Amino acid sequence: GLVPRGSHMSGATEACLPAGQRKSGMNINFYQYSLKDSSTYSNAAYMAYGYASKTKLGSVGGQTDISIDYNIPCVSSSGTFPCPQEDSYGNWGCKGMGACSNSQGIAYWSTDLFGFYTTPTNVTLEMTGYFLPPQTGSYTFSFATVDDSAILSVGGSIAFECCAQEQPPITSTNFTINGIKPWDGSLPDNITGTVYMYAGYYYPLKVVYSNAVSWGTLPISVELPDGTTVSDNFEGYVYSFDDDLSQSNCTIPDPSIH
């Protein structure tokens, strides 16, 4: 037939064609989150949008390396150095450093999260931008682990609205990856999610990440239609556009027929 039929029951992911100046990387907004609060970040509403009701701490733009790997200090006999989580032992030391004199349970200040000075022990952040698929097909995003709670959303009206990257968060809880910390322990059941994407359309992407104490971890990857994996450094795939709420044609509700 002359035209493609379209994804069944209007099932294609919404994408966008912003007409403004494209900028490399994602924007990161930082919000207050309380030290040792193991409940707030277990709620879907909080992780989708409620985080923005807490105080905004600041922001950084243009971020292409988006994985998180925050290691608390070990105040050791040889100086103060970050301790890989898997090297921590006892009550407590860090392998190759001896015993640590400092508490694992206090807030720590660092620029490890995107160069922004804050407390990676206890914070929530929102990454926004647009993913640009180079190839049409199935993309599988993943979190290798999650310390402590995280979601990933892809698509217009799921991550955010087209041409409206900078707006307050939308209320969708239709997460592509639900890595929300379970109520009473365990890892979330599944930390991959798949999206079918058409080459050359800009797909809204939101990651919301929260930590309550100590180590923070969110190693982000995507497997491309050709079977290759991109991990941590998403340069060439992720972009930002300043809002243009007046660009009438920006939203492509069905890229499979556009």
Q: Which long-range contacts (CB under 8 A, 24 or more apart) does 186-189 make?
A: 187/145, 187/146, 188/146
Q: Is residue 40 classed as helix, strand or coil in its secondary structure?
A: helix
- Binding piece for Na ion, criterion CB under 5 A, among 26-34, 146-154, 176-184, 200-208: 146-154
Backbone φ and ψ of 44, nearest 5°: -60, -40
Residue closest to Na ion when measured from CB atoms: 147
Contact partner, 14, from Na ion, Cl ion, none, Cβ < 5-8 Å per class: none
Query: Does residue 59 belong to the site contacting Na ion (CB under 5 A)?
Result: no
CA distance 142 to 223: 8
Query: Does residue 122 belong to the site contacting Na ion (CB under 5 A)?
Result: no
Select from 122, 211, 240, 251 the one that contacts Na ion (CB under 5 A). 211
- Tell which residue, 253, 242, 5, 13, has the closest CA to residue 133: 13
Contact partner, 211, from Na ion, Cl ion, none, Cβ < 5-8 Å per class: Na ion
- Tell which residue, 248, 238, 242, 173, has the closest CA to residue 204: 238
Contact partner, 36, from Na ion, Cl ion, none, Cβ < 5-8 Å per class: none
- Binding piece for Cl ion, criterion CB under 5 A, among 7-15, 54-62, 87-95, 196-204: 87-95
For the bound state, the minimum distance from the C-beta of residue 98 to Na ion, rounded and expressed in Å, comes to 19
Residues between 89 and 118 that touch Cl ion (CB under 5 A): 95, 98
The structure tokens listed for 45 are 């509403």
Contact partner, 200, from Cl ion, Na ion, none, Cβ < 5-8 Å per class: none
Rg (CA), the chain: 19
CA distance 33 to 41: 9
Query: Does residue 40 belong to the site contacting Na ion (CB under 5 A)?
Result: no
Contact partner, 201, from Cl ion, Na ion, none, Cβ < 5-8 Å per class: none
Q: What is the dihedral of CA 227, 230, 234, 239, to 10 degrees?
A: 10
* Residues near 214 by beta carbon (within 8 Å), at least 6 away in sequence: 72, 104, 105, 121, 147
For the bound state, the minimum distance from the C-beta of residue 159 to Na ion, rounded and expressed in Å, comes to 24
Query: Does residue 218 belong to the site contacting Na ion (CB under 5 A)?
Result: no
The site for Cl ion (CB under 5 A) is made up of 95, 98
The site for Na ion (CB under 5 A) is made up of 69, 71, 85, 147-148, 211, 214-215
